[PDB]
Amino acid sequence: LQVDIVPSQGEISVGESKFFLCQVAGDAKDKDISWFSPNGEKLTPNQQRISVVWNDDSSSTLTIYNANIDDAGIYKCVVTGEDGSESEATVNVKIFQAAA
């Protein structure tokens, strides 16, 4: 059971947006896919500055918009199997400010 995030790392300028695509390798027929923020919360699209989309049973896309410095950290994509199998991938999201 394997999950991967594209891109594998990211930097977002303050106020800007970036997406990360989590994909399961293989059949995710009976598998659940969830994104978690650095503070541990399971992420849902109603949240401020956050979008989570489940494209199909094998991939889920996280989008961070209007990026705040408080949004930086290790985000995690977890895939959970019917059989109790489980794996995760992590992406380190850095937030920065620079001359614009």
From Swiss-Prot:
Disulphides: C22-C77
Residue ranges occupied by any Ig-like C2-type domain in the UniProt entry: 1-92
Modification(s) after translation: Polysialylation modulates cell interactions by confering both attractive and repulsive properties that are highly regulated by ST8SIA2 and ST8SIA4. Polysialylation is formed on a-2,3-linked sialic acid of core glycans.
Domain of life of the source: Eukaryota
Biological role: This protein is a cell adhesion molecule involved in neuron-neuron adhesion, neurite fasciculation, outgrowth of neurites, etc. (Microbial infection) Acts as a receptor for rabies virus.
Subunit structure, as described in the record: (Microbial infection) Interacts with rabies virus glycoprotein.
The name this protein goes by in its record: Neural cell adhesion molecule 1
Lineage, broadest ranks: Eukaryota, Metazoa, Chordata, Craniata, Vertebrata
Gene: NCAM1
